[PDB]
Amino acid sequence: WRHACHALLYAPDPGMLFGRIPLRYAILMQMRFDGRLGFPGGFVDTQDRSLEDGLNRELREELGEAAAAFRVERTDYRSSHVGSGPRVVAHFYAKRLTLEELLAVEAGATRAKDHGLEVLGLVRVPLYTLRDGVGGLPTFLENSFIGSAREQLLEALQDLGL
Amino acid sequence: RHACHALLYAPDPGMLFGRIPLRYAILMQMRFDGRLGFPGGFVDTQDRSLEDGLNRELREELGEAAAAFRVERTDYRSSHVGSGPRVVAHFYAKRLTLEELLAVEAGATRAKDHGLEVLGLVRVPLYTLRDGVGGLPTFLENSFIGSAREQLLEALQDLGL
Numbered sequence: 405w406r407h408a409c410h411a412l413l414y415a416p417d418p419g420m421l422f423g424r425i426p427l428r429y430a431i432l433m434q435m436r437f438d439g440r441l442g443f444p445g446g447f448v449d450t451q452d453r454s455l456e457d458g459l460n461r462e463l464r465e466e467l468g469e470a471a472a473a474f475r476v477e478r479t480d481y482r483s484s485h486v487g488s489g490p491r492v493v494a495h496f497y498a499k500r501l502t503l504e505e506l507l508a509v510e511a512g513a514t515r516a517k518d519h520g521l522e523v524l525g526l527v528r529v530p531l532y533t534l535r536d537g538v539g540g541l542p543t544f545l546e547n548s549f550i551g552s553a554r555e556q557l558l559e560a561l562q563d564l565g566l
Numbered sequence: 567r568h569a570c571h572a573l574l575y576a577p578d579p580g581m582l583f584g585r586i587p588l589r590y591a592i593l594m595q596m597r598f599d600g601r602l603g604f605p606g607g608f609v610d611t612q613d614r615s616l617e618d619g620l621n622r623e624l625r626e627e628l629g630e631a632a633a634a635f636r637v638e639r640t641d642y643r644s645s646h647v648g649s650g651p652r653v654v655a656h657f658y659a660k661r662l663t664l665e666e667l668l669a670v671e672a673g674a675t676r677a678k679d680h681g682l683e684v685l686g687l688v689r690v691p692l693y694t695l696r697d698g699v700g701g702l703p704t705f706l707e708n709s710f711i712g713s714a715r716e717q718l719l720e721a722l723q724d725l726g727l
């Protein structure tokens with residue numbers, strides 16, 4: 405029928421926000437064209453050869469030529485949530501990159517086919533909670549998310565410690 | 567103590583999905599605190615003008631692309647005080663070319679604050695989808711810092727919608 409694939413792209417960061425709050429990882433979510441946060445990717449169309457073939461296709465389109473300097477494999481797979489109402493099964497993948505690899509995506513993402521149409525920009529995910537106990541991750545989640553993207557995210561943070 | 571933030575925007579001829587007109591590209595950013603806000607920060611002692619600490623904080627946050635244009639008093643829009651923090655927040659709107667803006671977006675990843683104070687830049691969606699909730703109505707649901715949303719919502723009426 406209609407399968408959709410989206411990727412979390414994550415690179416470990418030794419950097420320290422304010423020089424004391426440790427970042428731990430760079431994680432890329434995108435601001436979509438509906439004003440909801442989510443992940444790179446989307447529909448697997450009819451003449452795609454595999455789930456994963458179709459994903460790397462959408463990463464290129466949404467992220468740019470730099471997304472092509474790696475490939476999400478079957479092995480990067482995490483989950484599949486069935487969207488019942490809009491009859492669509494939605495597959496998730498998490499790809500470990502170098503911070504050099506992940507920065508090359510962000511720097512190239514403004515030349516992406518879909519930059520400034522489907523993809524309004526890329527945002528890193530703040531993992532820290534700030535002293536006030538609310539600024540950071542807790543607030544980041546208060547934002548608006550398309551379909552299961554908040555679950556996907558929280559499962560990814562969970563799965564790998566956090 | 568005073569703060570300054572800029573709205574940067576460009577005539578965008580583009581059509582989303584080849585029909586929906588984008589009108590203007592408008593830069594906001596995803597902040598270190600997980601809120602949407604505008605590039606800028608606290609002005610201090612040596613900054614001769616409000617515009618000096620502003621343009622200075624745009625250099626830090628948007629990279630050496632904002633060293634092409636300069637915001638001045640002519641761009642001023644509002645001063646909203648935040649009672650609790652005691653601070654007076656000042657707002658501007660700077661008109662650029664789509665090419666000037668693309669060049670900020672593209673450059674902002676080599677800025678001092680990329681992956682620290684600044685988590686990413688987003689274009690605001692000025693349109694509304696057929697469900698009448700997709701786009702701006704949905705966008706404004708997001709978290710924003712202090713008077714960030716009011717500033718946006720006031721500039722849009724004053725030119726952009």
Ligand SMILES: Cc1cc2nc3c(=O)[nH]c(=O)nc-3n(C[C@H](O)[C@H](O)[C@H](O)COP(=O)(O)OP(=O)(O)OC[C@H]3O[C@@H](n4cnc5c(N)ncnc54)[C@H](O)[C@@H]3O)c2cc1C
Pocket residue numbers: 408410436438441442443444445446447487490492494522550551552553556583584585695696697700
């Ligand atoms: C001319 C034209 C007009 C269009 N008008 C509209 C419109 O008005 N409204 C509209 O919604 N779409 C519209 N689209 C289609 C749009 O480009 C999307 O492909 C479509 O809305 C469904 O995909 P998506 O935006 O949800 O994200 P896609 O990346 O295309 O993903 C497809 C599916 O995955 C889901 N999804 C998206 N991001 C995530 C994520 N991070 N995690 C999990 N699941 C995710 C979506 O809910 C959808 O079910 C239009 C397309 C064209 C060509």
Ligand SMILES: Nc1ncnc2c1ncn2[C@@H]1O[C@H](COP(=O)(O)O)[C@@H](O)[C@H]1O
Pocket residue numbers: 569571602603604605606607608648651653655711712713714717
């Ligand atoms: N976009 C914004 N609009 C208005 N006030 C803001 C905005 N971003 C931050 N602030 C506030 O202005 C001060 C300076 O913020 P900052 O730029 O993060 O140093 C803080 O007291 C914030 O509460």
Ligand SMILES: [Mn+2]
Pocket residue numbers: 445446447462
């Ligand atoms: Mn798509």
Ligand SMILES: [Mn+2]
Pocket residue numbers: 444445446447466522
């Ligand atoms: Mn997509």
Ligand SMILES: [Mn+2]
Pocket residue numbers: 483485555556559
């Ligand atoms: Mn789940």
Ligand SMILES: [Mn+2]
Pocket residue numbers: 605606607608623627683
């Ligand atoms: Mn600032």
